[PDB]
RNA sequence: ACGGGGAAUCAGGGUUCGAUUCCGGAGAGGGAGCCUGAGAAACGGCUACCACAUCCAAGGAAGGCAGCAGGCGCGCAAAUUACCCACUCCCGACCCGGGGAGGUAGUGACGAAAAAUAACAAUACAGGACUCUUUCGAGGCCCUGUAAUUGGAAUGAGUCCACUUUAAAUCCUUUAACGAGGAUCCAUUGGAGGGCAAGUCUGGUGCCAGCAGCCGCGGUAAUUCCAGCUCCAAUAGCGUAUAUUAAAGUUGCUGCAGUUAAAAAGCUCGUAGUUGGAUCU
């Protein structure tokens, strides 16, 4: 078939710049945070266990 | 979640059935 | 039933090897016709010259045009159709240019939609396709 | 801490007889030749091409 | 031919199932509780424990009066008692099968430095060890994964060439004192 | 297909790999024939022929890197035309000379070991547990985090004297001086429907572009494409292609199947093969 449409969608996608952000901790300190986020202080529980990325 | 059971029962065989079943278990 | 006597070792071994010849993978690996017919000649990758850009129809349940290239391997001259993975990536390839081709993922078997295609382009003009796609490198002049 | 080895010789002449040359050079009692391995090897292979006394005429 | 040795080992093994909730949670619990850098340290400790259990299981099937069983079982039990993992009152071979991973993780220099009160956290303990503030007997130890021997435990000090033990101020104190 | 010692994987049994530093064999572009020598059918010895190929004043002469470097070619695929006999040893007439054997550096994400990229205190709190009170409150014990909120402490990555190292050096180790708040001295590679851990959030596209190992996603409300944000897996590493092992009790000795899923010869005889009843203190 025709090869004229070869970069169509990537070409028409509007460009959005990445936001500036703090650096993320690495190594032991990143694993520490995760441990704190998942195991240290989690009191609320309504029988759902919402995922870490529950947008809705 | 009851919402998961509802969304699964609406379309037991659909684009979102596998995810909702995995959530139910 | 199978023989079970203490002196039946030769019968068991001969039967096992004869029946081993009836296994698809074993026969493919040990007969020598598959390696002869393999365009890569048993190599993991190969290098070829782009002959033309071609568009291949996707299989019936889904409609699309898969952008591939006809390449001629340097080491044996065999002609091959190789898939150019990402979008816009066909624009990184020109005619009569060096390309490094690898397998598609299932041991010389066609993958997914694309019919009769078992190779994908890894490098174009000695620069990786991923680097070109992500803007890390530009096409040499 | 540091750990090493030491030798104390009965006399300086005995030390000069028994010590390896580089250790004497560390004390300043010995000097090595200034030629390189390549220089000597090429000189040897050049001398190999000439007969008796002319061997001394190539360097 | 060269004069080199090529004997080397892999100190860990990788789990067969990469994504499963229970294993990931248990490993994360261990990492957070003992201040570990990654899961490779957990798998390393798991591998040493697995090798020890395999040796013990090999020895158990042997005869009780078998001299090989007696010899290597005694050696294994004495090695385990020496590093503090086993109790001297539990010096029978089968008790080796009762050991857990936390027993081996508790004998690290990091956890012992935290337990002795030289540091106020397990992570503070790790940074204290890696910053050459900790010595065992007279040797300054720099490695957090230093399995502390049972006799060596009583000699864990602050490394008298360090600011916390030897009273010599470091870079920051000196610079901030020069500003006065 | 050089053979072994061995290597990868493996419950048990197995399958695969072994050109590769130790032992044995073979060869020095391909064959053949020899001299010397205790020991070669030796090629860093010689004599021919075959194939290549160097210089030539055209009469002639000289060749053999599957040694160390290095070049070409082939390819998916592999390092310096470095220093040294100081160590291990070897050779010689030899305590002395020589050794691209060998050692030392260089290149080196083959692969293996260790191991940074922050720690703490104070605040202020989403805050939580713990605690009395009657709800607030109190609870100032303990923990977590937006903390572009504060604060001093500790450091090595670097720069760099001097030792030490070494044949001479380098590296590592040891020590001066300098060296951290976005501590910008800024971790990546792959993913987020299921298998399989993690968003039917937002914008664009609209069976196109593409993704997708497999099932599938996309035809105007895409949990799957192109991106932003967020999230998770491993982490100084992580994707991809190919060989192979386990998974495979899908080669079945352990341990599979043959009525209908693939499968018992049309039937009988019969050599080799395999197996073969009690019984002897
Ligand atoms: Mg061969
Ligand atoms: Mg073999
Ligand atoms: Mg070999
Ligand atoms: Mg070969
Ligand atoms: Mg050999
Ligand atoms: Mg020979
Ligand atoms: Mg050759
Ligand atoms: Mg010969
Ligand atoms: Mg030669
Ligand atoms: Mg020779
Ligand atoms: Mg060479
Ligand atoms: Mg090339
Ligand atoms: Mg390579
Ligand atoms: Mg020597
Ligand atoms: Mg010598
Ligand atoms: Mg060598
Ligand atoms: Mg260098
Ligand atoms: Mg790699
Ligand atoms: Mg490694
Ligand atoms: Mg350093
Ligand atoms: Mg990412
Ligand atoms: Mg996305
Ligand atoms: Mg998935
Ligand atoms: Mg999931
Ligand atoms: Mg893929
Ligand atoms: Mg998906
Ligand atoms: Mg297999
Ligand atoms: Mg099995
Ligand atoms: Mg079957
Ligand atoms: Mg049938
Ligand atoms: Mg029948
Ligand atoms: Mg018969
Ligand atoms: Mg009988």
CSV table of C-alpha atoms in Angstrom, one decimal, chain A residues 10-50:
chain,number,residue,atom,x,y,z
A,10,UNK,CA,3.7,11.4,15.7
A,11,UNK,CA,4.0,14.4,13.3
A,12,UNK,CA,0.6,15.9,14.3
A,13,UNK,CA,0.9,15.4,18.0
A,14,UNK,CA,1.3,18.8,19.7
A,15,UNK,CA,4.5,19.2,21.7
A,16,UNK,CA,4.3,19.4,25.5
A,17,UNK,CA,7.5,20.2,27.4
A,18,UNK,CA,8.3,18.1,30.4
A,19,UNK,CA,7.8,20.0,33.7
A,20,UNK,CA,10.7,20.8,36.0
A,21,UNK,CA,10.8,18.5,39.0
A,22,UNK,CA,13.0,17.7,42.0
A,23,UNK,CA,15.4,14.9,41.7
A,24,UNK,CA,14.2,11.5,42.8
A,25,UNK,CA,16.2,9.7,45.5
A,26,UNK,CA,18.3,6.7,44.4
A,27,UNK,CA,19.5,3.5,46.1
A,28,UNK,CA,18.8,2.9,49.7
A,29,UNK,CA,16.9,6.2,50.2
A,30,UNK,CA,14.4,5.4,47.4
A,31,UNK,CA,13.7,2.0,48.9
A,32,UNK,CA,13.3,3.7,52.2
A,33,UNK,CA,10.6,5.9,51.0
A,34,UNK,CA,8.8,3.1,49.4
A,35,UNK,CA,8.9,1.2,52.5
A,36,UNK,CA,7.5,4.1,54.4
A,37,UNK,CA,4.8,4.7,51.8
A,38,UNK,CA,3.7,1.1,51.8
A,39,UNK,CA,4.3,-0.3,55.2
A,40,UNK,CA,4.8,2.2,58.0
A,41,UNK,CA,1.8,4.5,58.3
A,42,UNK,CA,-1.2,3.1,56.5
A,43,UNK,CA,-4.2,3.3,58.9
A,44,UNK,CA,-7.2,3.9,56.5
A,45,UNK,CA,-8.8,0.8,55.1
A,46,UNK,CA,-12.3,0.6,53.6
A,47,UNK,CA,-12.0,-2.9,52.1
A,48,UNK,CA,-10.8,-1.6,48.7
A,49,UNK,CA,-6.9,-1.3,48.8
A,50,UNK,CA,-6.8,1.4,46.1
